[PDB]
Design a binder for this molecule. Structure first.
Ligand SMILES: Nc1ncnc2c1ncn2[C@@H]1O[C@H](COP(=O)(O)O)[C@@H](O)[C@H]1O
Length: 508
C-alpha cells in the first residue's frame, strides 16, 4: 500500500488518533491529511507544475514540517528538508543546485531570519488556502522523486540524493513488515528531518498509523527536560544514532524505568558500539535491539540484525545485518569484481532502495552509481566482508567520516577552510584514537594577515565557516604551521601531520 494511501486511510478510519507530537503541539491523522491537502493546493498556485522542481521545507520539528512534506508530494513536487542548523550559505548552495522555486518556513521567521533568493512562504500563510484539495493523480508516484536529502560533498558543495516514491515505499514496507513496529505504536524522533535517519521512524510510523513523538534540539540541550519529555512520551519505538542513546545511557536514570513502554530499539547511521548494546540489554529487558546499516544514497538502511547477547559474544564487532530481503549486496574489489565470504572489499548495494543519483551532478553520480546485472547499484565507499551471510562493516576507503553520527567529508571542510583569504593551505585531522572520531583538528598554513593574538586569526576563520558549514563540521582545534607535507608528488601525508599535531597537543 503506497504510503500516502495508508495515511489517507488512517485519516478516515481513526481521524482522532494522534499522528504527530512535538513540544506540546499535536496533530491527528485527520488534521495532517486535511492540512497537507490544503497545502498541496496552495502550492500549485505558487509554482509551475511544468517541471517537478524541489520545494525546500525549512524549520526543525514543528507540525508544519510534516504537513509541508506531504503537501509538497501531494502537489507532485519532492521536498528538500532543511533544518534550522543549516547555515545561510549552505542553504543558498542547496537552493542554487536544486532549482527549487519555493521555500516554506514552518513558521513566521524572526529578527533577520529568512534572507534567500527564492519564493518564501510561511506554513501558516499557505494553510489559509481554501477548498484546497488536490487529487491522487497529482501525488508523486513510482520513480518520481519524493524527497531530496542533501549531504556533504567532498568537492566543497553539498550533493542532493534523490529518493523516489518507490525507493521510500520499498524501505517503508520493509520496516513495517520485518520489524516489531506495527500496531500503531509511539515512535520517537530525535534526528532532524534533514538527515534520512529520521525517515526510519517518520514514514514507517505514519504508514503503520502510529504516533510520532519528537524530541527537539531544545530538549536535548537540557538533560533534565530531555528525560522529563521522554518519560511522559510513553514511546514504544526508539530510533536514533548510537551516539544519541549513548549520551542518554550516560545517566543511570535512563533504563526500563524511565521508558516503561519502550520495546524496540532501531539504530542506524554509525557503528553501534558493543558496549552500548550490552547496556541496553541490561537496562531495557523488555525491548529488542536492531542494528541496520546503509548510506543515504540507498534510502536509510539496507540491512538489519537483532542484537542479542548471543550475537554479542559471537563477535567483538557487531555485524550490520543481513540484506534487505529484496536488496543485493556484494563485496566488490579494487578491480571492480565480486569477492567470496571472508575477503575484505567495498560494500556494494544493488536494488530498489538505490537512488537514481545526485541532483544536477551527473559526473558525481556516474562515479558512484552503476548498472550491475541489470539493477541500479551504488559503491558505498565502505570496506567490509560477509561472514555467515551477514555483512560486517569496517572503516571507509575514502576521506568521509562520522563524528558523533554526523556524516561529513574531510575534503569539503578543507575546501572551505582553504577558501578563506587568511588561509593558504589546510588539512583537517580527525582525532580518532580508538576508531570513533571525537573531534577534528585543522592544521593551517596561514596567509600573512594583520591580526594580534591567535584566537584572532582562528576566530575570523571559524566565523566564516559558521556561514557555510553546519556547526558539527567546524573543526574544534586550529593549529598553524609553515607548510604541508605533500606526498605522492603532491598528495599530502595526512598520517604524519596528525602525529605532529598530537605531539604539539602535549606542549602547552
Ligand atoms: N549500522 C552501521 N554500522 C556501522 N556503520 C554504519 C552503519 N550504518 C551506517 N554506517 C556508516 O554511516 C554511513 C552512512 O551515512 P549516512 O548517509 O549519513 O546515513 C555508512 O556508509 C557507514 O559509513
Amino acid at each position: 500500500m503506497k504510503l500516502l494511501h495508508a495515511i489517507q486511510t488512517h485519516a478516515e478510519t481513526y481521524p482522532q488518533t494522534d499522528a504527530f507530537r512535538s513540544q506540546g503541539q499535536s496533530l491527528t491523522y485527520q488534521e495532517l491529511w486535511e492540512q497537507s491537502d490544503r497545502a498541496a493546493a496552495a502550492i500549485q498556485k505558487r509554482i509551475s507544475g511544468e517541471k517537478k522542481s524541489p520545494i525546500l521545507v525549512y524549520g526543525h520539528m514543528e507540525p508544519h514540517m510534516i504537513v509541508s512534506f506531504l503537501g509538497s508530494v501531494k502537489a507532485g513536487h519532492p521536498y528538500i528538508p532543511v533544518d534550522l542548523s543549516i547555515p545561510s550559505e549552505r542553504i543558498a548552495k542547496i537552493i542554487e543546485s536544486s532549482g527549487a522555486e519555493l521555500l516554506i518556513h514552518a513558521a513566521g521567521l524572526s529578527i533577520d531570519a529568512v534572507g534567500q533568493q527564492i519564493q518564501t512562504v510561511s506554513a501558516e500563510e499557505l494553510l489559509e488556502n481554501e477548498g484546497g484539495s488536490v487529487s491522487q493523480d497529482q501525488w508523486v508516484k513510482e520513480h518520481e522523486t519524493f524527497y531530496i536529502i542533501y549531504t556533504s560533498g567532498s568537492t566543497g558543495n553539498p550533493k542532493g540524493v534523490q529518493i523516489s516514491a518507490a525507493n521510500l515505499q520499498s524501505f517503508t514496507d520493509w520496516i513495517c513488515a520485518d520489524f516489531p513496529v506495527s500496531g500503531g505504536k509511539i515512535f520517537l524522533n530525535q534526528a532532524p528531518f534533514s538527515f534520512d535517519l529520521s525517515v526510519m521512524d517518520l514514514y514507517p510510523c505514519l504508514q503503520s498509523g502510529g504516533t510520532l513523538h519528537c524530541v527537539t534540539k531544545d530538549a536535548v540541550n537540557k538533560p533534565k527536560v530531555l528525560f522529563e519529555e521522554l518519560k511522559k512520551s510513553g514511546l514504544n519505538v526508539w530510533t536514533s544514532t548510537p551516539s544519541f542513546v549513548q549520551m542518554c545511557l550516560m545517566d543511570p536514570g535512563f533504563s526500563q524505568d524511565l521508558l516503561p513502554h519502550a520495546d524496540t530499539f532501531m539504530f542506524c547511521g554509525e557503528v553501534l558500539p558493543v558496549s552500548v548494546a550490552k547496556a541496553l540489554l541490561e537496562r531495557f529487558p523488555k525491548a529488542k535491539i536492531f542494528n541496520t546499516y546503509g548510506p543515504t544514497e540507498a534510502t536509510v538502511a539496507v540491512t538489519s540484525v537483532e542484537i542479542t547477547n548471543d550475537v554479542i559474544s559471537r563477535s567483538e564487532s557487531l555485524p550490520v545485518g543481513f540484506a534487505k530481503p529484496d536488496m543485493n549486496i556484494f563485496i566488490m574489489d579494487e578491480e571492480g569484481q565480486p569477492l567470496p565470504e571472508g575477503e575484505k572489499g567495498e560494500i556494494v548495494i544493488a536494488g530498489p532502495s538505490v537512488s537514481r543519483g545526485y541532483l544536477g551532478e551527473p559526473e558525481l553520480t556516474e562515479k558512484a552509481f552503476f548498472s550491475h546485472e541489470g539493477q541500479w547499484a551504488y559503491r558505498t565507499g565502505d570496506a567490509g566482508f560477509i561472514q555467515d551471510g551477514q555483512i560486517f562493516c569496517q572503516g571507509r576507503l575514502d576521506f568521509q567520516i562520522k563524528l558523533h553520527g554526523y556524516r561529513m567529508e574531510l575534503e569539503e571542510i578543507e575546501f572551505h577552510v582553504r577558501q578563506s583569504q587568511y588561509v593558504r593551505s589546510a588539512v583537517v585531522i580527525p582525532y580518532q584514537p580508538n576508531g570513533t572520531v571525537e573531534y577534528l583538528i585543522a592544521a593551517i598554513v596561514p596567509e600573512e594577515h594583520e591580526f594580534e593574538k591567535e584566537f584572532q586569526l582562528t576566530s575570523a576563520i571559524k566565523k566564516e565557516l559558521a556561514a557555510s558549514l553546519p556547526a558539527y563540521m567546524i573543526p574544534r582545534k586550529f593549529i598553524y604551521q609553515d607548510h604541508i607535507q605533500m606526498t605522492a608528488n603532491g598528495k599530502i601525508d595526512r598520517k604524519r601531520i596528525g602525529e605532529e599535531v598530537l605531539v604539539r597537543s602535549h606542549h602547552h
